[PDB]
Amino acid sequence: SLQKKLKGTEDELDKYSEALKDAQEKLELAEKKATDAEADVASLNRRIQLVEEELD
Amino acid sequence: LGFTSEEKNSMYKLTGAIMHFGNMKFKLKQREEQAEPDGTEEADKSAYLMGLNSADLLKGLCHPRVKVGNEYVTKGQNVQQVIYATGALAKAVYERMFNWMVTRINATLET
Amino acid sequence: TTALVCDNGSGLVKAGFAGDDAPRAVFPSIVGRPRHQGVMVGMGQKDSYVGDEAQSKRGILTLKYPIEHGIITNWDDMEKIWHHTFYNELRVAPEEHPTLLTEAPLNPKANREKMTQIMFETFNVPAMYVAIQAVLSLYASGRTTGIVLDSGDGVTHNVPIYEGYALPHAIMRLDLAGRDLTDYLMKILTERGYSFVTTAEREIVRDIKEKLCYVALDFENEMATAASSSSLEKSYELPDGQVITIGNERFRCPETLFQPSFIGMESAGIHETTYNSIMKCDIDIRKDLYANNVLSGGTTMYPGIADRMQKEITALAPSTMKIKIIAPPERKYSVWIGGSILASLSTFQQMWISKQEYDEAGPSIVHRKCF
Ligand SMILES: Nc1ncnc2c1ncn2[C@@H]1O[C@H](COP(=O)(O)OP(=O)(O)O)[C@@H](O)[C@H]1O
């Protein structure tokens, strides 16, 4: 009689696995984006200090 | 030829089962290297044709049992392994039906 | 012709033919001798029982293991074991079959040399080869890199391999295994009154261990759970009757693998020798090694040991790497499976030690590039 319990557990497990996969996908995406944006801002900031000493 | 209509019917349905083997779909598990089926409909219909249970055939494909001395232990499979096994099973059943058809032909011819 | 694959191990002999999916002869590596007098004349009883027969006659014999920690200590007993394996379980003539033997890393050299000498002089095989257990485990696992942790019954060892190259300076070997876990369980089972002292009650305790023990994912929380509840307490029925009830020592036994101080050893757990082997390897293969951490051998068969190992190694390694632990269901036979694969490889048929090579170069020919 516990087979329905087993099947329901399998279903919620599958749902949670899909959820985890989607969350990992969004995580790696946003992390690549944040790292790239930080690279750009650091580069251009150093460039700003260089053009500032240039102006000086 | 000497063989009945039911036998031609079984031949045709067996070939259709071989055809149904190809569309099976397997995925890796959650955080492991084990294969598990996601699509079950073609599995159900191929079992209903072949004369087996669908859950039982899926279990026999994902988890073979091998004999170690006097005990049986379950072997693990991934997607590539289960696909190679499916292909070999189909080739085997086809060639088997073919050889037996030739035996039936020779029995009809036999004097 | 076909080659035999005899995975001697230490506490379980596994033999078969090269090219099969599993061994066809798995029996304990014990030799028993009767300890009582024997009164019935005409019984014509033997003087020493080998293998699975000794486990039937347990109550009458003294069971001795001829292999302590990988190392063979009783050469006459081991020769009896091999004779039984060749003639009674497999039923083959060893003078027609090459034989592939296995050994653990970092054993004495006389072990391997005397093994070769026996296999050529006594059993008269045409060729032979001694292989390392971890390499064969990696063959059977389908990998070509990865750090393998082969916990048998005598020894535990890590052997990191990358692209088929083994890094010998990073090989670790620990002398804690299933036999020490059995002794620790015999010892801590006395807290509830059960006493197992005979050399044949050790087999009963080994059965209890196999059937009831498991690894806790967190040790203090399971300690508290057992102190409060009784939901983890299970029962077992001896060969005599009189069921015994096992409480929190279901998970205190295999916890010795992660806390070798329980049995008074100095060393560190398996989770920490694995990580130390990693950190002793190079810097640019550590990511692959973290991702390909392979388990094999009987002492890795506890429930929850993979999850525990992953939790520990994950807490040890840097937070930016995917740590993955490969634990097949046919772990216990991985060394034998890999040995069969290797001996069937057509490329391997030139790595055997032929009999003429031995006759001309002595038993020292074993440590050559066939090492
Ligand atoms: N399911 C299990 N759980 C825990 N320990 C086990 C299990 N199965 C076997 N063992 C232990 O494994 C040991 C045998 O390991 P094995 O792979 O045979 O090594 P070897 O071949 O070198 O003896 C035995 O001492 C036994 O206690």
Curated annotation (Swiss-Prot), chain A:
> Which cellular compartments is it found in?
Cytoplasm, Cytoskeleton
Could you tell me in which tissues this protein is expressed? Detected in primary breast cancer tissues but undetectable in normal breast tissues in Sudanese patients. Isoform 1 is expressed in adult and fetal skeletal muscle and cardiac tissues, with higher expression levels in the cardiac tissues. Isoform 10 is expressed in adult and fetal cardiac tissues, but not in skeletal muscle.
Lineage top rank: taxon: Eukaryota
Which sequence positions carry the modification called Phosphoserine? 1
Transmembrane stretches, start-end:
none
> Any S-S bridges, and between which cysteines?
none
What is the role of the protein in this entry?
Answer: Binds to actin filaments in muscle and non-muscle cells. Plays a central role, in association with the troponin complex, in the calcium dependent regulation of vertebrate striated muscle contraction. Smooth muscle contraction is regulated by interaction with caldesmon. In non-muscle cells is implicated in stabilizing cytoskeleton actin filaments.
Involvement in disease: Cardiomyopathy, familial hypertrophic, 3: A hereditary heart disorder characterized by ventricular hypertrophy, which is usually asymmetric and often involves the interventricular septum. The symptoms include dyspnea, syncope, collapse, palpitations, and chest pain. They can be readily provoked by exercise. The disorder has inter- and intrafamilial variability ranging from benign to malignant forms with high risk of cardiac failure and sudden cardiac death. Cardiomyopathy, dilated, 1Y: A disorder characterized by ventricular dilation and impaired systolic function, resulting in congestive heart failure and arrhythmia. Patients are at risk of premature death.
Q: What does UniProt say about this protein's domains?
A: The molecule is in a coiled coil structure that is formed by 2 polypeptide chains. The sequence exhibits a prominent seven-residues periodicity.
Tell me its family: Belongs to the tropomyosin family.
Q: What protein name is recorded for this chain?
A: Tropomyosin alpha-1 chain
Species annotation: Homo sapiens
What high-level taxonomic lineage is stated for the organism? Eukaryota, Metazoa, Chordata, Craniata, Vertebrata
Full-sequence range covered = 45 to 100 of 284
Swiss-Prot record, chain B:
The organism's place on the tree of life at top rank: Eukaryota
What subcellular compartments does it reside in?
Cytoplasm, Myofibril; Cytoplasm, Myofibril, Sarcomere
Q: Which residues carry this modification: Phosphothreonine?
A: 40
Relay the domain remarks.
The rodlike tail sequence is highly repetitive, showing cycles of a 28-residue repeat pattern composed of 4 heptapeptides, characteristic for alpha-helical coiled coils.
Protein purpose: Myosins are actin-based motor molecules with ATPase activity essential for muscle contraction. Forms regular bipolar thick filaments that, together with actin thin filaments, constitute the fundamental contractile unit of skeletal and cardiac muscle.
* Family to which this protein belongs: Belongs to the TRAFAC class myosin-kinesin ATPase superfamily. Myosin family.
Q: Per its UniProt record, which disorder involves this protein?
A: Cardiomyopathy, familial hypertrophic, 1: A hereditary heart disorder characterized by ventricular hypertrophy, which is usually asymmetric and often involves the interventricular septum. The symptoms include dyspnea, syncope, collapse, palpitations, and chest pain. They can be readily provoked by exercise. The disorder has inter- and intrafamilial variability ranging from benign to malignant forms with high risk of cardiac failure and sudden cardiac death.
As a miscellaneous remark, the entry gives: The cardiac alpha isoform is a 'fast' ATPase myosin, while the beta isoform is a 'slow' ATPase.
Assembly, in brief, is: Muscle myosin is a hexameric protein that consists of 2 heavy chain subunits (MHC), 2 alkali light chain subunits (MLC) and 2 regulatory light chain subunits (MLC-2). Interacts with ECPAS. Interacts (via C-terminus) with LRRC39.
Q: What is this protein called?
A: Myosin-7
Curated annotation (Swiss-Prot), chain C:
- Which post-translational modifications are recorded for this protein? Oxidation of Met-40 and Met-43 by MICALs (MICAL1, MICAL2 or MICAL3) to form methionine sulfoxide promotes actin filament depolymerization. MICAL1 and MICAL2 produce the (R)-S-oxide form. The (R)-S-oxide form is reverted by MSRB1 and MSRB2, which promotes actin repolymerization.
What the entry lists under InterPro entries is as follows: Actin (IPR004000), Actin/actin-like_CS (IPR020902), Actin_CS (IPR004001), ATPase_NBD (IPR043129)
From the Swiss-Prot or TrEMBL record, state where the protein is found. Cytoplasm, Cytoskeleton
| Enzyme class, UniProt record, top EC level | hydrolase
Superkingdom of the source?
Answer: Eukaryota
Q: What are the recorded Gene Ontology BP terms? A: actin filament organization; actin filament-based movement; actin-myosin filament sliding; actomyosin structure organization; cardiac muscle contraction; cardiac muscle tissue morphogenesis; cardiac myofibril assembly; heart contraction
The chemistry this enzyme catalyses reads:
ATP + H2O = ADP + phosphate + H(+)
* Record PTM Tele-methylhistidine, positions in chain: 69
N6-methyllysine, modified sites? 80
Q: Find the cross-link Isoglutamyl lysine isopeptide (Lys-Glu) (interchain with E-272).
A: 46
Identify the GO cellular component terms for this protein: actin cytoskeleton; actin filament; blood microparticle; cell body; cytoplasm; cytosol; extracellular exosome; extracellular space
Q: Which UniProt keywords apply?
A: Acetylation, ATP-binding, Atrial septal defect, Cardiomyopathy, Cytoplasm, Cytoskeleton, Disease variant, Hydrolase, Isopeptide bond, Methylation, Muscle protein, Nucleotide-binding, Oxidation
Q: Name one Pfam family in it.
A: Actin
Q: Give the Enzyme Commission number.
A: 3.6.4.-
Q: Gene3D superfamilies, alphabetically?
A: 3.30.420.40, Actin, Chain A, domain 4
Which positions carry Methionine (R)-sulfoxide? 40, 43
Site of the Isoglutamyl lysine isopeptide (Glu-Lys) (interchain with K-52) crosslink? Answer: 266
Q: Which GO terms describe its molecular function?
A: ATP binding; hydrolase activity; microfilament motor activity; myosin binding
Question: What does the record's miscellaneous section state?
Answer: In vertebrates 3 main groups of actin isoforms, alpha, beta and gamma have been identified. The alpha actins are found in muscle tissues and are a major constituent of the contractile apparatus. The beta and gamma actins coexist in most cell types as components of the cytoskeleton and as mediators of internal cell motility.
Described by its record, this protein's role is as follows: Actins are highly conserved proteins that are involved in various types of cell motility and are ubiquitously expressed in all eukaryotic cells.
Question: What is the designated name of this protein?
Answer: Actin, alpha cardiac muscle 1
* The species this protein was found in: Homo sapiens (Human)
